[PDB]
């Protein structure tokens, strides 16, 4: 576990 | 698109 791949960033909100 | 799901928290850096 840890920070790559997830939630956060990605598809849903933004540009 | 840039925020939401995709990347960021769960797996990655950590492992």
Same mark, same amino acid.
């Given at each position: =576990?840890? %920070?790559? =791949?997830? =939630?956060?960033?990605? %598809?849903? /909100?933004? /540009?």
């Amino acid at each position: =576990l840890x %920070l790559x =791949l997830x =939630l956060x960033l990605x %598809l849903x /909100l933004x /540009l």
